[PDB]
Structures are given as C-alpha cells and as structure tokens.
Design a protein around this ligand. Structure first.
Ligand SMILES: [Mg+2]
Ligand SMILES: [Mg+2]
Ligand SMILES: [Mg+2]
Ligand SMILES: [Mg+2]
Ligand SMILES: [Mg+2]
Ligand SMILES: [Mg+2]
Ligand SMILES: [Mg+2]
Ligand SMILES: [Mg+2]
Ligand SMILES: [Mg+2]
Ligand SMILES: [Mg+2]
Ligand SMILES: [Mg+2]
Ligand SMILES: [Mg+2]
Ligand SMILES: [Mg+2]
Ligand SMILES: [Mg+2]
Ligand SMILES: [Mg+2]
Ligand SMILES: [Mg+2]
Ligand SMILES: [Mg+2]
Ligand SMILES: [Mg+2]
Ligand SMILES: [Mg+2]
Ligand SMILES: [Mg+2]
Ligand SMILES: [Mg+2]
Ligand SMILES: [Mg+2]
Ligand SMILES: [Mg+2]
Ligand SMILES: [Mg+2]
Ligand SMILES: [Mg+2]
Lengths: 104, 66, 117, 70, 88, 272
RNA sequence: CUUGAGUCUCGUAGAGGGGGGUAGAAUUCCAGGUGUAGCGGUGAAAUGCGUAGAGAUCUGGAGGAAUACCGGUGGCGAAGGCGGCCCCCUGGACGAAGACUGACGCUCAGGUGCGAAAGCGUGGGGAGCAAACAGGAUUAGAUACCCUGGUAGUCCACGCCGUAAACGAUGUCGACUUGGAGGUUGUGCCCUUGAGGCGUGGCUUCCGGAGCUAACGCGUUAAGUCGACCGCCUGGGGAGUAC
C-alpha cells in the first residue's frame, strides 16, 4: 500500500456539501481497507489567483494509506464531480500523521 | 542566509507557504540559489514545492492584480 | 461629456512606436495618441521625445473628461517607457500606481528568426 | 514590477522605485532575449563562452593581478 | 523490479541454503523471474528502448551464467533448465 | 487489423482488407432481422432519382436501437456482429430482464461488457444519458437532435461529437464535419466514439468490389453527347465549360444549403 | 582459493525511458464593449493592415505548441538525447555493512539492436515559426542579406530512412605514477557548541609538475608508463566517385 496525500479544493458555494463528501471518500477508502493517516478540513481560503473566475476555495487535506485502484477511483470521482474545482493526489513514502503548517 | 542550516531541514513542505514566501520574489518568481544561499539539493526541493503550491493556488504564479 | 476623475494610462512602448491610451478604470478608452500621429516618422518617432509629445497630446485629448488621478501601466521595451510618464506627470495628473505589464511567455510560441545584419 | 506611490512620496522618487523594480525583475532583458529565436546550439555556445570568460577574468584579476604594476 | 519476498522465495527454492544468494542456479532463477515479469511491461510499452536495454543486459547475463554452468557441471545445467523451462 | 492482400492476380494486388476477428462468425439474431429489398435508386414513379445505385448483395436489415430507452435496466454486451447496412459494427446486448437488442458498437466495446442508459448511468463508453448530464468536453456518439427521436448524429464508423459548451437548455456540439451546432440538452447521447475506426483504411481493389456494394459505374459528363449533359462532347477532348451537375447547376464551390428554418441552430458552418 | 566478475539486504540523488492527466503565462483567431486615425515595418522606405472602424484597451470563447523564474562549465543516459506539476509501468548508477558464487572475465571480424535534424508512406492535427513561392526595398544585377505575407515541414500515431563538425575531431577494458582550487552526490567519526572540524567512496570543471608531443598542448577523467583485443591510415587531386 502506497501512502498518498490528497488535497482537493471545492467551490465555496458548495462548502456546505463538504462534510458529507469527506465522509463518503473516507468511507470508500475504509471499505477498501484504506487507512486514513490525517484529515484536515482547512476550510474556506483566499486563492492566490482566480480559478474559473471564483475566489475563496474550500480546501480539504487527506493523507491516506490505500490501494492504488481505490486511489484511481477517487481521482475519477474528483474529476467527474462538478463540485471539486481542483485536486492533487500526491504520493508520499511514510505515515505523515503530524498536523500540517496551515492548521498550525 | 540558508535558513534550513539550523534544522538541516528534513523535508520542505509545499504547504509551508510561510517559508516559501521567503524563496519567491515580489513578482512570484523563484529566487536564485546564489542569491539566497540555499544548498543545491534543498534548492531543488524548494523549487518543486513552490511549483506545487502555485498549482494549488497557495502561492501566485505572478505579481499581477489578482 | 462625462467625468471620471481617475483613469489608467496604458503606455504601449514598442521599439518603433509609442501608443498612449487613457482609459476609465474599467477598460473603456477615452483618448489615445501616438508619436506617429504626433508628427514623427521613422528615426524621429522611435525616440523618447516623440513619446513625450504623444503623452502631452493624449492628456489634452482627455481633458474634457477631467481626469485627476491616474495609474500608469507600462508595456513593452521602448524608448519612452519613462518619457511618457514624465510628460503625463508634467501635464498634471497625480500618478498613483506605476505597473509594468510587459507580456513575457513561459516558454510558449516560437519567436521569428534572427535578423542577419 | 508593481509600485504604489506612498503618501508624501515625490513623483521623481516614485519613478526611481519603479525603474529599480523593473531592473530587479529583469523585464527588459527577458523581452530582448525573447525577441528572436536563439537556436539551442547558440544558447549553449553563448553560455559556454560566458562561463569561460567569467572564470578566466576572475582568475586573472585575483591571482594574476597580485603584482607590482609600477 | 522484483519484490523482496518473491526474491527470497526464489532464493529459498534454488538456493542450497537460505543465505546462499550467489549460487549460479539462484542467479539464473532470479534473472529468469525478472525477465518473465518484464514481458508484460514491454508488451505494453514497445517504444521503451532504454528499459529494453536493461532487459537485454539481464538476458545476456543469464546466457553467460548458463554457459558457465554447462561447462562446469552438466547435470546441474540440465536440471536447472528443466526446472525453469528454458530452451538450451 | 489491416491486411494487404498479396498480388496473386491484378485484382487482389491493390486490395486492403480490414479484418476483425472479434465479430460473430454466425447467423444474426433472427427476431431483430427483417426484409430489406433493394431500390436501384428508383422512386415510386419508377424513375432513377439517384444515379449509380443498383444490384449488389442481398442484405437483411438489423433493427438497431438508436433511441436507447431502456433506462435503468443494465444490459450486458454478448457479442459484436457485422452489419451489412452500415459502416459501423453492431453489438448484441442482453438486458437483465431478458430482452435483447442491437446497438451501435462503440470503441473498445466487447463481449461481456456492461452498459446502462439513463440519468444515473455511469459516464463510460456505451452508456447513454441526456446531454445535460454528460460533462462538457466529452466525446459522444449517436446523438439525438429532437429529444426522444433517436440518435442521428455520429453514427458512422469511428465518428464522434465534442460537447464544446452547455448554456442553459442547449449544448453546443462540434460535429465531425467541423460544424458547430446547438442541440437541446435533453437530447440523448452515447459516450465514446463509434467503433470500427479502420473502415476508412480499406481499399476495394477492383471494380467488382464496388459492384458488390451496389455501386454502378459513373459516366463522366464530358464523355457524353451535348444532348446528354451540360458538358456535352466536342471533337477530341474539348471541355471549355464551367463544371456543372447533369441538371445544369454549377458544381465545385457553389453553396446549396437553402434552409432558414434551422439556421438559428447553426452556430458556425463547417470549414475545410 | 578469493583479490577480477557477479548475487542478496538497506538506503540515496537524478530533465534516465514509456503511458495517461492537468496548470499558468504568452501568441493567433473569433464574438462583443470603449474608442479614433492611424498601425506595422526600416538605415530610410514600400508592400501589408485601417474610416467597410484598425492599432490600443477590457470581457468571454476556441485551439495548437512550448514549459519563464528555479537553471548551474548542475544532474541523468552507451551514444543519439532528456527540462512545468501529478499519477501508473520501468532501466541503470552510487554508498553502508556484512553474507553468498568461485575466474563465471576483457575485447570482438561477421551479425544484431539503438541512432539528432532534414526527408519519405498512411491517417490526424496545425496556434507560432517557416524551406518553396509571392510582392516591396537595396543594387550595376540581387533568382540573397532587410521588410510584408506564406505552403510543405516543425506537432501526434504507427512504419521507413540510417546519416551529422553523430566531436573530447581522443576505440573498449585493466594496472601504475607529484599537486592545488572548486562543483555535485553518498557515508564514518567530531558535542552539528553554528552555517561548522577530521576522514572515506562515486561522478565532474579548471590549473599545473614529471613525462610526452612537430609544436599547440595533454597532464591520476593523460595525449604519461604499460598489457589484451578490435577499427582505421599510407602523397595531393581523380574520389568516398564509376561499375
Ligand atoms: Mg521582425
Ligand atoms: Mg455517383
Ligand atoms: Mg468514379
Ligand atoms: Mg468515370
Ligand atoms: Mg462520345
Ligand atoms: Mg446542353
Ligand atoms: Mg466535352
Ligand atoms: Mg468528346
Ligand atoms: Mg483537340
Ligand atoms: Mg481551348
Ligand atoms: Mg527522475
Ligand atoms: Mg550515472
Ligand atoms: Mg561490426
Ligand atoms: Mg523528425
Ligand atoms: Mg510526415
Ligand atoms: Mg500527413
Ligand atoms: Mg512568418
Ligand atoms: Mg522572411
Ligand atoms: Mg560518417
Ligand atoms: Mg552531438
Ligand atoms: Mg569521425
Ligand atoms: Mg563492447
Ligand atoms: Mg593542464
Ligand atoms: Mg597519384
Ligand atoms: Mg556512393
């Protein structure tokens, strides 16, 4: 199992849908025997440059140990869900559980 | 001066926008290693981090109005 | 007929020519002037002085609008790039912000071939 | 090279900051270089020449110019 | 590349001892497994010439080793190539 | 695969077959067949209304499902088949409730594959959903023009359409001709490109092949006598005329679209 | 037998290769707003574009190609070559301690593979650039240089071609022979007291001793002292041409 690190930015008008979404993604990972090493809702945040003409995207961070098939499925879900503006699944070597600088 | 020397930084983090802002100029451009004094390995790591942040709109690509 | 008080001066300063364009803060152009129309051709319109008189002309043109504050956006490598802003200030606007907006590509389209002179 | 003129800053001073900012950015140099397509070989050759000249000059100054000129 | 556990299993199978890694048979077996594994990859990626260079090197090494076995000890060679199902 | 036939005769030397071994070597599903007698390009007045049509092979008509209305019930692709009535290949599918149906085969599609029409249907090749549901940018085929009418656009081999925009009730389609066209967003559209893409790589190799496909020989107007064609015929090979159809209307370059009812839907006419 | 050669364990750095996504800047085009006589170009002009509203400026859209800064006589690769970010597949190099095999090695005529750019075939794509081509200049002429345009091509898939000043103008492998200053990447000890002290490997740049060289220069990455094998040369032209 490969340690990943997903960060996805959500449309701020759909910020209320975010708790359910987090639950769904985590649930899928667990269902597929995926561990969840850190989970940080960073919330609404000011973009450094306007994406799709809209500012203030809602950032969610998720460091996960999962299989790659499930990572692929998650990526596909991200791409087709017209809610997540950006995503960034990024491989990591170890269990990076400590809290991130943005929460710090 | 090479900030990471005191740590011997374990890994540079693209989310650490606080320090990456020392390694980008006013216009958003990456500062040369010769000017900031970063070690070459670390400089490469930082550049990668900056690029990732730019992708995630944590840092800006350029100094323009928005 | 309208008044705006605060404009943007877009100084397009290519090697051959200087175009000055005063606009409302939104983007809509009020008046413009060039060294070519200012009465300079070739070696004479590719000079700082020509740019200055173009700037003066532009200021005169937009005098109707009664523009008081002005931010200047300089573009391109040019003989003016300075003369125009100096002239504009002399013509008597408060220069608030001066910004460079020269469009650099991030390694994009291929430039034309090198001149053999 | 964005500049905003501060309260009670003279215009000439503002101009000076703007010019300095532009020079630091290196906008004019970038545009001039990107005016025409330099071939990759040409770029490599120029880089090599610059490196050689710089090194040679530095060596000459520091080590060769440690003698009595008069 | 070949996983650690798989490599260990190969070593145990053909290795006189589980700390034996240099044995010719073990070396040949490891190479063969690697080559077999890489077949799928190269079927997918026919233009991966650099990687195919690596594969070719593996093949050459196996041939050289096999030849060494043939001259040294014929019975071992015959048994090994029957076990692995390698032509000649 | 494409296969160059060896030159054992001057009839085979230029032949290029497109051979697909995945097709069904067997008889088609007899409930979906029906009779399809030939016209010879003649209308109900018995007159030749389209030249150069005649003969060829007998052909049963497969009843292909362009409407794609079994919403929700998931089907599975049993087998790919050869359809003589179209360039594309068809696919015999089996709906969970027991109904079988022919559909156009999309790209990559094969036996045992699972497909589903509907709104909830997953975005994957062979699934069919209203074009408001399909992401903008997606390549689609068998596209409907009037909601519920049945796919009309991009039915031919390797064809497809780009959903370039969705503004309200209409999606903008970049059609295969290059044409941009507004279509109602309620119009159905099957994901992916239509299969047998190598169809165009085939080379008939002889006159007989065309004949087998029912195409009778074309006679050049300039071969004819002045009474027969506006290109008449002179002594030797003269021409001197501006090219024209047999019925005397300039050919090559003269536009003929006469349709003001539908111009509102044409966002941009094709180019090149 | 274990010193050459290889295997296993753990790490390390890397534009190494293949596939698939994606980001921002910029050019072009398209539609719209503002706006008015110029723009463009050059040594100076003209062709060209613009009162049928251009250039300038703001908004939106399309599409292709390439990845600013970082960036380095930096790195990787047998060479050709490789440069945004992300994932999937994948090859090699290097260090540490051990353990294992036990000369399994070096080189290689034929042979086989890889091999920039241009070029070719078939099917796509086509923004920018640009052989050919067109017009404008210059000129004695100007089938050029300069200017305005501009098609193959440059891009993608899969085949072919099989060559370059494909150069370090320096065949591969191994051993031995004074030094200095760097770069890069490991690693051992020293309290890292700080960025730091003393070692020990790999690759790499420059300078220089002996020696070598016609000289220029090379100089522990040799063009020095040697061993193995290969490739190649024997005056200029004719000619890397004819058959
Ligand atoms: Mg030019
Ligand atoms: Mg006909
Ligand atoms: Mg014909
Ligand atoms: Mg005919
Ligand atoms: Mg006749
Ligand atoms: Mg007639
Ligand atoms: Mg005739
Ligand atoms: Mg005749
Ligand atoms: Mg005649
Ligand atoms: Mg005639
Ligand atoms: Mg790498
Ligand atoms: Mg290496
Ligand atoms: Mg040979
Ligand atoms: Mg090529
Ligand atoms: Mg071609
Ligand atoms: Mg072509
Ligand atoms: Mg051009
Ligand atoms: Mg030209
Ligand atoms: Mg040669
Ligand atoms: Mg070379
Ligand atoms: Mg040579
Ligand atoms: Mg060799
Ligand atoms: Mg030397
Ligand atoms: Mg002779
Ligand atoms: Mg010859």
């Amino acid at each position: 199992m490969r340690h990943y690190e997903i960060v996805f930015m959500v449309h701020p008008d759909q910020s209320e849908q975010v708790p359910g979404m987090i639950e769904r993604y985590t649930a899928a990972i667990t269902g597929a025997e995926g561990k969840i090493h850190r989970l940080e809702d960073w919330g609404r945040r000011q973009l450094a440059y306007p994406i799709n003409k809209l500012h203030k995207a809602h950032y969610v961070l998720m460091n996960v140990e999962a299989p790659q098939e499930v990572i692929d499925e998650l990526e596909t879900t991200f791409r087709f869900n017209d809610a997540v503006i950006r995503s960034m699944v990024m491989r990591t070597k170890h269990a990076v559980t400590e809290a991130s600088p943005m929460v710090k | 001066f090479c900030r990471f020397t005191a740590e011997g930084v374990q890994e540079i983090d693209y989310k650490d926008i606080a320090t990456l802002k020392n390694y980008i100029t006013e216009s958003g451009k990456i500062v040369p290693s010769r000017i900031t004094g970063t070690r070459a390995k670390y400089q490469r790591q930082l550049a990668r981090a900056i690029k990732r942040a730019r992708y995630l709109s944590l840092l800006p690509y350029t100094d323009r109005h928005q | 007929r309208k008044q705006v008080s605060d404009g943007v001066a877009h100084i397009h300063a290519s090697f051959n020519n200087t175009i000055v364009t005063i606009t409302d803060r939104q983007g809509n152009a009020l008046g413009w002037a060039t060294a070519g129309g200012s009465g300079f051709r070739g070696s004479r319109k590719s000079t700082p002085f020509a740019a200055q008189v173009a700037a003066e002309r532009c200021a005169d043109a937009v005098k109707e609008y009664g523009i008081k504050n002005l931010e200047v956006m300089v573009k391109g490598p040019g003989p003016g790039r300075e003369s125009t802003i100096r002239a504009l200030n002399a013509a008597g606007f408060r220069i608030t912000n001066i910004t460079d907006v020269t469009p650099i590509p991030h390694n994009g389209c291929r430039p034309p071939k090198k001149r053999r002179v | 090279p964005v500049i905003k003129v501060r309260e009670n800053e003279p215009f000439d001073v503002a101009l000076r900051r703007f010019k300095r900012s532009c020079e630091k950015a290196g906008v004019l140099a970038e545009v001039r270089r990107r005016e025409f397509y330099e071939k990759p070989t040409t770029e490599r050759k120029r880089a090599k020449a610059s490196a050689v000249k710089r090194h040679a000059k530095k060596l000459a100054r520091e080590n060769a110019r440690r003698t009595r000129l008069y | 590349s070949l996983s650690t556990e798989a490599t260990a299993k190969i070593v145990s199978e053909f290795g006189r001892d589980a700390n034996d890694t240099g044995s010719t048979e073990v070396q040949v077996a490891l190479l063969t497994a690697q080559i077999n594994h890489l077949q799928g990859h190269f079927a997918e990626h026919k233009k991966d010439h650099h990687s195919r260079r690596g594969l070719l090197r593996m093949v050459s090494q196996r041939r050289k080793l096999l030849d060494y076995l043939k001259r040294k000890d014929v019975a071992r060679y015959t048994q090994l190539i029957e076990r692995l199902g390698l032509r000649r | 695969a494409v296969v160059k036939c060896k030159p054992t005769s001057p009839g085979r030397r230029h032949v290029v077959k497109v051979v697909n071994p995945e097709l069904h070597k067997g008889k088609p599903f007899a409930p979906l067949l029906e009779k399809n007698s030939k016209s010879g390009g003649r209308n109900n007045n018995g007159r030749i209304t389209t030249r150069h049509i005649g003969g060829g092979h007998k052909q049963a008509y497969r009843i292909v499902d362009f409407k794609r209305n079994k919403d929700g019930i998931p089907a599975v692709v049993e087998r790919l088949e050869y359809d003589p009535n179209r360039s594309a290949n068809i696919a015999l599918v089996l709906y969970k409730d027991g109904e079988r149906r022919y559909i156009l085969a999309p790209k990559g599609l094969k036996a045992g594959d699972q497909i589903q029409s509907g709104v909830d249907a997953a975005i994957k090749p062979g699934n069919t959903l209203p074009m408001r549901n399909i992401p903008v940018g997606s390549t689609v085929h068998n596209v409907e023009m009037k909601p519920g009418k049945g796919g009309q656009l991009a039915r031919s081999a390797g064809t497809y359409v780009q959903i370039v925009a969705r503004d309200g009730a209409y999606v903008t389609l970049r059609l295969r001709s290059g044409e941009m066209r507004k279509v109602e967003a309620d119009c159905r559209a099957t994901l992916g490109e239509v299969g047998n893409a190598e169809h165009m790589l085939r080379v008939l190799g002889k006159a007989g092949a065309a004949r087998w496909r029912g195409v009778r020989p074309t006679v050049r107007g300039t071969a004819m006598n002045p009474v027969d064609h506006p290109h008449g015929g002179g002594e030797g090979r003269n021409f001197g005329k501006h090219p024209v159809t047999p019925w005397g209307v300039q050919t090559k370059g003269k536009k003929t679209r006469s349709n003001k009812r539908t111009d509102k839907f044409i966002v941009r006419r094709r180019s090149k």
